[PDB]
Amino acid sequence: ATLTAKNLAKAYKGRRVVEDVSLTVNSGEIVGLLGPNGAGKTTTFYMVVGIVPRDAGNIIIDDDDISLLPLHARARRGIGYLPQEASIFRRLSVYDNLMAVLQIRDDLSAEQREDRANELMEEFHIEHLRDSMGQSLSGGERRRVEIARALAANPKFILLDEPFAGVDPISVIDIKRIIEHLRDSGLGVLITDHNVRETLAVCERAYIVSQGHLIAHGTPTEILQDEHVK
Amino acid sequence: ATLTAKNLAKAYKGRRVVEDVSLTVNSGEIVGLLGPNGAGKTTTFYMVVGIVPRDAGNIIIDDDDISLLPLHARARRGIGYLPQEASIFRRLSVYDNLMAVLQIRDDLSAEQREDRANELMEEFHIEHLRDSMGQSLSGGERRRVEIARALAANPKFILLDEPFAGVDPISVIDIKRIIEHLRDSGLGVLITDHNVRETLAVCERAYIVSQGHLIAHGTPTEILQDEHVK
Amino acid sequence: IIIRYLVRETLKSQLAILFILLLIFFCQKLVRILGAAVDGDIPANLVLSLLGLGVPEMAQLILPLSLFLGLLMTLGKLYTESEITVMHACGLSKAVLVKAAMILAVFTAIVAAVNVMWAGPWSSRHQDEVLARAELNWRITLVFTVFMMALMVVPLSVVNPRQGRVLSMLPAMLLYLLFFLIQTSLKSNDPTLWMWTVNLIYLALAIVLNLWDTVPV
Amino acid sequence: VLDRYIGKTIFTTIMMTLFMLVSLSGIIKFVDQLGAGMYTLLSVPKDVQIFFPMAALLGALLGLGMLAQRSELVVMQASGFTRMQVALSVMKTAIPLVLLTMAIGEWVAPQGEQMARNYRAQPDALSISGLHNYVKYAGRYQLNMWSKIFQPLSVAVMMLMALSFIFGPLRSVPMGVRVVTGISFGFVFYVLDQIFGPLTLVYGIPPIIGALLPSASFFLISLWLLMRKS
Amino acid sequence: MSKARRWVIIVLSLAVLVMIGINM
Ligand SMILES: CCCCCCCCCCCCCCCCCC(=O)O[C@@H](COC(=O)CCCCCCCCCCCCCCC)COP(=O)(O)OC[C@H](O)CO
Numbered sequence: 001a002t003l004t005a006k007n008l009a010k011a012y013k014g015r016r017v018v019e020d021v022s023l024t025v026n027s028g029e030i031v032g033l034l035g036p037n038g039a040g041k042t043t044t045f046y047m048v049v050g051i052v053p054r055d056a057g058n059i060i061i062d063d064d065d066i067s068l069l070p071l072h073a074r075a076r077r078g079i080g081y082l083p084q085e086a087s088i089f090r091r092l093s094v095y096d097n098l099m100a101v102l103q104i105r106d107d108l109s110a111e112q113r114e115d116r117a118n119e120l121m122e123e124f125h126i127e128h129l130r131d132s133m134g135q136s137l138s139g140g141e142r143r144r145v146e147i148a149r150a151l152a153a154n155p156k157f158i159l160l161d162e163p164f165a166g167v168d169p170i171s172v173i174d175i176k177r178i179i180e181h182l183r184d185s186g187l188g189v190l191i192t193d194h195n196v197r198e199t200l201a202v203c204e205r206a207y208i209v210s211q212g213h214l215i216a217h218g219t220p221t222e223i224l225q226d227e228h229v230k
Numbered sequence: 231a232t233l234t235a236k237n238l239a240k241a242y243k244g245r246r247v248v249e250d251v252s253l254t255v256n257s258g259e260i261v262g263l264l265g266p267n268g269a270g271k272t273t274t275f276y277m278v279v280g281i282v283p284r285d286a287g288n289i290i291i292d293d294d295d296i297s298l299l300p301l302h303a304r305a306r307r308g309i310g311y312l313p314q315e316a317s318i319f320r321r322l323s324v325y326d327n328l329m330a331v332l333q334i335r336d337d338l339s340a341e342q343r344e345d346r347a348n349e350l351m352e353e354f355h356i357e358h359l360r361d362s363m364g365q366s367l368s369g370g371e372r373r374r375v376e377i378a379r380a381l382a383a384n385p386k387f388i389l390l391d392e393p394f395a396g397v398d399p400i401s402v403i404d405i406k407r408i409i410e411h412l413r414d415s416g417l418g419v420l421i422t423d424h425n426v427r428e429t430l431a432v433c434e435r436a437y438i439v440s441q442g443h444l445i446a447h448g449t450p451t452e453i454l455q456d457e458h459v460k
Numbered sequence: 461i462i463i464r465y466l467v468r469e470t471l472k473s474q475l476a477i478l479f480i481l482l483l484i485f486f487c488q489k490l491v492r493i494l495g496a497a498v499d500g501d502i503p504a505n506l507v508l509s510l511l512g513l514g515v516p517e518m519a520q521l522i523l524p525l526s527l528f529l530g531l532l533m534t535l536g537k538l539y540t541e542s543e544i545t546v547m548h549a550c551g552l553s554k555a556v557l558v559k560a561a562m563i564l565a566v567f568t569a570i571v572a573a574v575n576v577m578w579a580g581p582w583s584s585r586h587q588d589e590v591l592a593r594a595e596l597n598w599r600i601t602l603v604f605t606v607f608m609m610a611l612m613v614v615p616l617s618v619v620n621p622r623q624g625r626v627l628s629m630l631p632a633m634l635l636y637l638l639f640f641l642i643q644t645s646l647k648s649n650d651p652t653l654w655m656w657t658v659n660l661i662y663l664a665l666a667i668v669l670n671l672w673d674t675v676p677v
Numbered sequence: 678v679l680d681r682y683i684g685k686t687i688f689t690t691i692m693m694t695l696f697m698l699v700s701l702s703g704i705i706k707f708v709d710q711l712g713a714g715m716y717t718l719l720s721v722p723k724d725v726q727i728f729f730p731m732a733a734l735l736g737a738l739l740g741l742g743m744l745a746q747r748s749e750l751v752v753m754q755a756s757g758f759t760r761m762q763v764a765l766s767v768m769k770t771a772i773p774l775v776l777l778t779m780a781i782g783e784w785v786a787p788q789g790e791q792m793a794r795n796y797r798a799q800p801d802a803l804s805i806s807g808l809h810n811y812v813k814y815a816g817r818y819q820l821n822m823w824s825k826i827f828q829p830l831s832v833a834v835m836m837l838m839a840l841s842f843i844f845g846p847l848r849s850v851p852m853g854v855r856v857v858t859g860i861s862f863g864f865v866f867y868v869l870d871q872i873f874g875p876l877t878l879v880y881g882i883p884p885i886i887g888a889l890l891p892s893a894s895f896f897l898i899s900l901w902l903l904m905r906k907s
Numbered sequence: 908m909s910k911a912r913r914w915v916i917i918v919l920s921l922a923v924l925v926m927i928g929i930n931m
Contacts, residue, residue, distance in 0.1 A: 037396065037398065038369075053907060071754055071755055072754060072759045074755075079755075080755070084748070085748050087749060089682070092682060100756075166267060167267070168266045168426075170459075196398075196399055197427065230400055279549070300673055302548075310549065313546055315542055317542045317543055319465065321469070329461055330462040330465065333552065380546070380549065383550045624853035625853050626851075626853025631919065634920055641927070642926070645929050645930045705928045708928040711928075
């Protein structure tokens, strides 16, 4: 019910961009991860997921070091992920897209392939679209199915990647409902985004890196004081 | 010295985007063009600086119908565009970069042409370096140079295209000093953005685009008061 | 200055597309001294000057292609980084690109002239020896190509960035191949020199397509 | 099932990149007249013996590209699958294709090619079966015997070549270079099958496996790309 | 794309593609 990735370091052809970074999340929290661009926002975050491999340290989820193990079994281990842009399968039916992850759930039976399909379909109030092509949705409607194809993998800790990345600010009030709803069931959500003065309204630890160094952390009220964070 | 757009429009594939656009600028004011995504911020802004063809309307600079004139001619009349992404000259010296603007500046004689650029490197604080290839510059130091290019062509109306394009907020107040500095020298500036929390601090009067209309004829104080803003 | 910015860089990629093109046509000829020497009675150890000093059979054919596709590739890098449209939105017009294309074409048209007259019989009369009307008039419609494709490729360099680079430079490479293949079928054929208007139509297309936005309706 | 999705996507293009490309080489066979002769309508599958495997890459990488750079392959990655399980899916839909080019080597194509030259009245390829024990007294026909047994094997190697450098070097690139690299490794089979036949026939003292080597050098490359980087 | 850009690369390519067969 707790991951920890200690002492994360990474170099690009003999050039250090991330070096000795550590963070602790628990179950039931939203933890931000901010900073300046090109300095350790993504390269720390993409190495927790596993798109880029590590160079040192240990990524531990419940006393189980998964550091040698890439992304192709971390979703089976309990780490969810979803990209920055449109990632609906966009040739397939929505109901078929929703149980697409449910087929690789080999501890489950065939009558339960309707159970976690039909429970999770009517959970997000999108059950009126059982037959729909992939390129027949909108920006406030694509995102709600894309979240739904991440709870279906049954993860412990989902890791978003800048969800509000090009929406108008009188529409981020409904994304924050989805973030709190995932926060409601106890699964931890670690996000990284560039607009700093928007994600501080919904976050609870908010690590901040720069130049591949941990600088300040803790809580948002106890972080607006330091000289080094300016 | 006053742009006056009147009744702009655009249509393709039997579908319309732009109707009834009548924005103006003046010498010494910072005019926003904020709004939602895809509803016609970009198509209106590319209509003023005609990368896209005009279908209807007219734009004038002191009774000079320059609407049919392409980007060849609007540089000769007072319009200076600034692109979104990294638009520096790639592998060429920074002092040599300002000189390439000053070839076709034939009203200004070519003996202060090597002298005004000596003065012009001073005020944007770039004269720390004078010979450097454009590869080895960062996203903040280069931002003070792309502005210096179109400023060297001596326009009346600089035209910016999202200078708040996802940088750290300690560099927002870096750019905010530049915009308040180039409004002092009589230059009107139109600006588009999606960072509307930071656009409405540098502005005097804004506009809006909601699928064609103009619902924002006035000041930033009339934004927290008006009802049809949703 | 800004003319010097182009011709120091297109010639930095002229030579790079040259050597990858001079090597890709050895392996369509060195095949033909192994795939034809066992099939069409050509000896074995004569290749050292047959493949060696056989190069004006091909180097009269790739200098108008390497100057063309060298210039096209280095304008595709120059539009998609939006370095054209901060230079275009300054005072200088489209003519800076066209004036630059002629200067880099002189450094090829001199080479295409010295090859076609002086380094031709250096192999055709000092290496055609073993050591072991039918007029062609194709040498003038090959020097004239070099000052012609460079004049028309600078308006055909748009990239319209929703579509990719390779699809953007498709109607240029495919239009050069149409021009540079009539001029072999109209060499083997017999109304010869009637193909001089074929050289003149795409010169008129080189003027029509170059200025198509300065003019009114 | 989404294993019936990647296989459907590959089989969508591997016919579509074939029918466009064979008929491109069909309309170029209006050379015999240089008018009622349907000589090119009658010798269609004679090209599909050899004009198929270079379309078995361009098309298994064209169509899988628009499955990958729509940010979709890194979702099935992060939702339970292994890198091997997606490699098993193209081989689940290679076996309806290697058998389909096995059929034209015996039944379809040389039956019409027998009457190809006969219909236009005013390497001695016959079949796999009839050419077996035809060369009993060896020679060049023993090579083009042994070339034609596992010429259909190269199609199964080809979709393992196409999937090889879609996980390695060539993934974060635009769609245009996936065709040029998708054709330069397809054009190179012309300059490889048409030399190492006469190489081994002249110089190669193992005269039997001179045709295995073109379909062997595109297997060492595929085992290097997916067993060295990670 | 455009209304003409998906109509030039069909006609002009076809004039290339038939012209190879003249001297093949
Ligand atoms: C027998 C063959 C000999 C020559 C064949 C010539 C065929 C056509 C001549 C060359 C046309 C292709 C040259 C480049 C095409 C467009 C490049 C360009 O400048 O941009 C646009 C130019 O527009 C066109 O492509 C249309 C040009 C011709 C329209 C149709 C052809 C008319 C030809 C008349 C007679 C043709 C007879 C045979 C046809 C080949 C096209 O893209 P866009 O308009 O979507 O975006 C750019 C925007 O327009 C910028 O302003």
